[PDB]
Every structure is written in C-alpha cells, then in structure tokens.
C-alpha cells in the first residue's frame, strides 16, 4: 500500500489501517 501524505484526526496512518487496506482497496493514491 501507499502511505498518506499526513496524518489526519478522522482518518490516521497505522499499521493495521494498511492491513485492512491490503484486501478491501490496495490501489489507492496516499496524495492529498
């Protein structure tokens, strides 16, 4: 996966976030 460009209160970058990520949407864009 593809980390964010910053951490935000609603959506943060952890670890079990791109867990998730690698089976429900793995091609997303982290530019904001």
Sequence with gaps: ???QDF???V???TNTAQ???TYSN???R???
């Design 11 to 13: 959506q943060p970058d």
């Design 7 to 9: 951490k935000t209160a």
């Design 26 to 28: 793995p091609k997303q």
């Design 19 to 21: 867990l998730i990520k």
């Design 1 to 3: 996966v593809q980390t």
């Design 30 to 32: 982290g530019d904001k």
